[PDB]
Design a protein around this ligand. Sequence first.
Ligand SMILES: *O[C@H]1[C@@H](O)[C@H](n2cnc3c(=O)[nH]c(N)nc32)O[C@@H]1COP(=O)(O)OP(=O)(O)OP(=O)(O)O
Ligand SMILES: Nc1ncnc2c1ncn2[C@@H]1O[C@H](COP(=O)(O)OP(=O)(O)O)[C@@H](O)[C@H]1O
Ligand SMILES: [Cl-]
Ligand SMILES: [Mg+2]
Ligand SMILES: [Zn+2]
Length: 670
Amino acid sequence: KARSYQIELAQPAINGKNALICAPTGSGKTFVSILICEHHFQNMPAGRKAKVVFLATKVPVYEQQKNVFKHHFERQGYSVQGISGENFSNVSVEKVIEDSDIIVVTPQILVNSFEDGTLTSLSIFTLMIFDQCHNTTGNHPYNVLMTRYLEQKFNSASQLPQILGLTASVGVGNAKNIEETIEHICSLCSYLDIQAISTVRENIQELQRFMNKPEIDVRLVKRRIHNPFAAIISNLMSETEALMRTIYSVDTLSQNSKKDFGTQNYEHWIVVTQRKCRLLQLEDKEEESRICRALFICTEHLRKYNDALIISEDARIIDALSYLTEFFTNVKNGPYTELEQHLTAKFQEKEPELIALSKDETNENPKLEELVCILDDAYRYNPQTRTLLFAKTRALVSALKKCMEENPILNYIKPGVLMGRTGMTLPSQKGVLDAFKTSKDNRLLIATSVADEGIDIVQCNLVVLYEYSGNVTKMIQVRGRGRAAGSKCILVTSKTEVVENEKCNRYKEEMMNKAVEKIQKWDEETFAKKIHNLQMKERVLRDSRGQKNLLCGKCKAYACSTDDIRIIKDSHHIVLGEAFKERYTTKPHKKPMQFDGFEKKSKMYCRNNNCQHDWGITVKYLTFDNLPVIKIKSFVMESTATGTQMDFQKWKSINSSLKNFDVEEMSNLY
RNA sequence: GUAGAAACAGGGGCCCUGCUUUUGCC
Ligand SMILES: *O[C@H]1[C@@H](O)[C@H](n2cnc3c(=O)[nH]c(N)nc32)O[C@@H]1COP(=O)(O)OP(=O)(O)OP(=O)(O)O
Ligand SMILES: Nc1ncnc2c1ncn2[C@@H]1O[C@H](COP(=O)(O)OP(=O)(O)O)[C@@H](O)[C@H]1O
Ligand SMILES: [Cl-]
Ligand SMILES: [Mg+2]
Ligand SMILES: [Zn+2]
């Protein structure tokens, strides 16, 4: 049965308009899309049949919505099917579309199907529903599809499906006022060819009875007064930078650092330095290799020190020390050249003091104590509480898991951990969430942004954001995880910037809502004209728009020529010939699974034992075993014409100049 | 293989460009 705000929201789309539905998370936007579907099905003109596609950005959501529509519509005699990457391969997409009244998909499935010629026109659909439609932007699959929709609209020799978009936040982009916010929202509208924005105006009070927007609480807590740990590590980082200058004048390559150790700014300095160092070209190739490798290692070490600093700010000294000791264990197990031995020793020199510092309990993190106090208060007051605790990085989430494991809240509450996809698998993720839902003692969940939206999580009465800031849409989603009766959302930070950030988000949320009500004042003509002008602008922006050797990204040793490379299925870059087999060595893949028609066999590495750089994998494919598949990020390209060296993060530039795989060519190579 | 977001800063005169962090998708 429908609520009145649900009926209200469905009205423009029921009248056949391309509609954008803005309504709060969990308010029942999906139920609204179902009401529109029902109406769609019944009001088809003579001789027409409906074909609905529901698009979802993620597999969990894909699965949830698939089963919603199955349950709602199969009992009414409708055929409801779904395609995701998990079955894309074993089904014909054309056939599924042919046999189905409603099809639910992840959007890339459709993109793949246009690109491979399976589909030619979007006229096969009468209604396209885009869950989380605010993702229609840039090179997102949603926007690839809507670009195709608009290209067809512009060669208007066909009828196009109705568009429906579901979101809880249209966003504001870079808007600083109502006017620029209005521009941003209209842009989104133009990308989706919207004709009406549908919000709750008439039935606001009923909405407010079902939805309870948590009271936020923003707490600024004090940092450590002294951080001896960070003094030490910083000196090591200074030592390491000076050693780096000894090796090669990085002043002639990159700039000198501002020694702002343990900052994002430093993090990005090291990253820029790395790319410059690896693009070093010398006459003497032996020296190029020697220098580049030693700078590779130095920058790697500098990054880990920086990481350890940042970890120590948000967590315990021991968590930061653990991170480094695990790293150095790996150093000791790798090539472990003389330079790596030197660095490990300089560290082990200082390690006794660090172990000492990490054991002092007056050397404890104020911000982490405050976190623990917050949790203790909640579970003391209400032991039924279920908490969702968010933090930015995997390293921080791991640290917080260890904390809450070794120091359980009120000495009984146990944490679960949720990270993205060692990551976690979707089965693992689901396992964790089920425990978090049902368990008596597992009432705390620690998560990265994996938990912001989409995947189904039991409602929480406490949401804690631990130095976890972001944009207005993130804020809106994250609060939607806290809708249990008398829920709180608490932002814990030691940074005024983050407090101001959250102050801005409040402004923008209210700016956004005001911007929408102004747009809703306009008549259809005014709106339609505006959206059209932007589609025309977008269109005019689109109007405007040799042989190389690959070198080990680390030791600069010759790998292969671009002439030896073949592309399989536009994605996978294999290397032909016996010569290349001399250049690498393999180890069994630790996860030897199958995907895209390929079976993973091995990891590939630079054969240079002093390097051992990861180059990719080997696979079984068709009638071929142990095909090497290289990844672009492991290599530096060098032009055979100019001699000059290039870095590339994506194949996209190069692919134009590479031959495609030919099973007949391959067959002759034996 | 590749997409979004956020942070950090090289180019154009507010977009472009990269980078990491993070999540995703095939
Ligand atoms: O360049 C990649 C790519 O060609 C192929 N590949 C690996 N993972 C994926 C994937 O999720 N999706 C697609 N389309 N293609 C993929 O293998 C090449 C090498 O990649 P990696 O070296 O990262 O391979 P793998 O993930 O097995 O290494 P690791 O995860 O064990 O580090
Ligand atoms: N009118 C209704 N009657 C009963 N349950 C409803 C109703 N509207 C929504 N729900 C329930 O609310 C939950 C959230 O709805 P959903 O459409 O997923 O929200 P949204 O897409 O707006 O985030 C679902 O479990 C759904 O069954
Ligand atoms: Cl070698
Ligand atoms: Mg990989
Ligand atoms: Zn190498």
